[PDB]
Design a protein around this nucleic acid. Structure first.
Ligand SMILES: Cc1cc2nc3c(=O)[nH]c(=O)nc-3n(C[C@H](O)[C@H](O)[C@H](O)COP(=O)(O)OP(=O)(O)OC[C@H]3O[C@@H](n4cnc5c(N)ncnc54)[C@H](O)[C@@H]3O)c2cc1C
Length: 508
DNA sequence: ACAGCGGCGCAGGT
DNA sequence: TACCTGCGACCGCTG
């Protein structure tokens, strides 16, 4: 085995065995040549970032669980995961030389960090005489090809995007990789000799530095659970078929929606397997919804955002963003901290922000409620700030998706009907009139009648006391007054829209 | 050139 | 039930 070469698959995104052309390529190459190769499936933990703040304790746990599952699955194919600690730049040079790597394969990522990183690793491999074959399986449709077919522009409207995509071929969704035939463990590398457990899966302690920030384990990580959740979600085909996003409740105690997003984000679930499964159901169901409200529609929204983000490195900022509106957002530190910790004084908003911090997922409509309140609805705080918070607390934190959807809610891009402002009091009531959701996440107000649980300021002091929650002590006073402010922000929106319009006129 | 069209709010009705 | 319409006047795309 001294004369063997190594074939390597690099997991960054796409943490699954199913529908992984990059991964499969290896496994099939290996057994095609039974005794000529050593297979290393690797994940590169950049350990320094653990102390980093744009990672929630909850998301760390999700990754930890994901890697363990991925290892277990790999184990069943006579292999294993290798979690290599270090920076790609300082690891790869060592591994190609020490393992004698012949091929490196990975799933392509459009994010700017990933672009610059991959380019660097492409360059390094090119010098070192290492073959690199990359595959595009994070999204159904390659954003590069979508732009191409729209004459080199990324479509900035959903209907237009659908028209472009439908005329593109949908790639074949693969199964799991084959069981490696005749594959002894690769000999320990310099680092493995010194410590055998070096490329083992990280323990919870190793990844979760601040475990007190962990909330209830509602959504376990990994491909196994992803597939399991999906199958259960697809069980009721009628539900699936007649699914319309706006008609789903943000405040229901159990999720109205699938909650497959985190799995789709980490690549524990293949968006192509999902698309494929959905299509099969629509076909068996005459009465069914269509885009953009339908469940396939929602998947196509993910693709939309991925395309537009691919064309713009400044996708996650107002400044230098081609799609984005230039709006004079204002600094309001105290207002920002209050919103971050769900102490706005608005129970519905506070409920949502708390669920987010505690569980790491909140319903899409709920995200709307909070985002609007923060950006154009009331506070007048920049969407970049909200994006920052969400990045920290979301399990399904996605650079393209989070950016794109925050612009939408701030009416900076992709949305423009700024007269439509969500009422932090009115919006919640329609689907949870009793205020059950508020009672759960803001238990301080759990004894309040439905008549003013959304609007505690409407209750007299004698009333508050009697409810066991006196405002200004046991609960925060509302930081702003929605009726006065939102109308005022509406005017500011129109002002900033006009200004952007001149700038456009002037370039011409 | 530019207007008509299609694109997850609220309140107050039937 | 699941519509209707003022609100004040948005955008991108189309012909
Ligand atoms: C301000 C804001 C930030 C968001 N940030 C993220 C994010 O960071 N990562 C993320 O995956 N989604 C994000 N979303 C989109 C959406 O809220 C979630 O994907 C959805 O709530 C997840 O619940 P689900 O997976 O059950 O959705 P379902 O309704 O079950 O939809 C299933 C799939 O649709 C895809 N999808 C649904 N809505 C959207 C959307 N608006 N844009 C793109 N894809 C969508 C989701 O990936 C999900 O995997 C954000 C939305 C908003 C308003």
């Amino acid at each position: 085995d001294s004369q063997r070469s190594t074939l390597v698959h690099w997991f960054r995104k796409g943490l699954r065995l199913h529908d992984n052309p990059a991964l499969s390529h290896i496994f099939t190459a290996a057994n095609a040549a039974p005794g000529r190769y050593f297979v290393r499936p690797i994940f590169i933990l950049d350990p320094g970032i653990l102390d980093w703040m744009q990672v929630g304790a909850n998301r760390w746990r999700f990754l930890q669980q994901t890697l363990e599952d991925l290892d277990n699955q790999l184990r069943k194919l006579n292999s294993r995961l290798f979690v290599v600690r270090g920076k790609p730049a300082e690891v790869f040079p060592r591994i190609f030389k020490s393992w004698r790597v012949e091929m490196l394969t990975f799933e392509t990522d459009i994010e700017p960090y990933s672009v610059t990183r991959d380019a660097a690793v492409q360059k390094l491999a090119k010098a070192e005489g290492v073959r690199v074959e990359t595959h595009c399986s994070h999204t159904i449709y390659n954003p590069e090809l979508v732009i191409a077919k729209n004459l080199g522009k990324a479509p900035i409207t959903y209907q237009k995007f659908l028209g472009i995509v439908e005329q593109l071929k949908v790639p074949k969704v693969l199964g799991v990789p084959e069981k490696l035939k005749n594959m002894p463990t690769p000999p320990k590398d310099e680092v493995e000799q010194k410590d055998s457990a070096a490329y083992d899966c990280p323990t919870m302690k190793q990844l979760v530095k601040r475990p007190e920030e962990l909330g209830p384990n509602k959504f376990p990580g990994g491909e196994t659970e992803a597939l399991r959740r999906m199958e259960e979600s697809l069980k009721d085909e009628i539900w699936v078929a007649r699914f319309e996003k706006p008609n789903t409740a943000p405040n229901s105690l159990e999720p109205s929606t699938t909650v497959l997003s985190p799995y789709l984000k980490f690549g524990c679930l293949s968006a192509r397997l999902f698309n494929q499964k959905l299509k099969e159901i629509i076909k068996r169901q005459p009465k069914h919804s269509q885009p953009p409200v339908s469940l396939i529609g929602q998947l196509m929204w993910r693709e939309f955002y991925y395309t537009v983000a691919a064309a713009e490195p400044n996708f996650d900022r107002m400044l230098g963003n081609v799609y984005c509106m230039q709006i004079p957002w204002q600094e309001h530190p105290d207002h920002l901290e209050a919103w971050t910790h769900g102490r706005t004084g608005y129970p519905f908003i506070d409920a949502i922000m708390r669920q987010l911090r505690q569980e790491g997922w909140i319903h899409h409509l709920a995200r709307h409620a909070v985002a609007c309140f923060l950006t154009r609805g009331d506070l007048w705080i920049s969407w970049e700030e909200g994006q920052r918070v969400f990045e920290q607390l979301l399990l399904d934190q996605d650079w393209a998706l989070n950016a794109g959807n925050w612009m939408w809610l701030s009416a900076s891009a992709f949305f423009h009907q700024y007269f439509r402002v969500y009422s932090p009091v009115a919006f919640g009531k329609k689907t949870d009139p009793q205020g059950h959701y508020i009672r759960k996440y803001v238990p301080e107000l759990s004894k309040y009648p439905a008549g003013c649980i959304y609007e505690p300021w409407k209750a007299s002091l004698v009333d508050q006391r009697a409810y066991g929650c006196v405002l200004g002590t046991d609960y925060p006073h509302r930081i702003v007054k929605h009726e006065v402010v939102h109308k005022e922000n509406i005017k500011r929106m129109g002002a900033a829209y006009k200004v952007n319009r001149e700038v456009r006129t002037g370039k011409e």
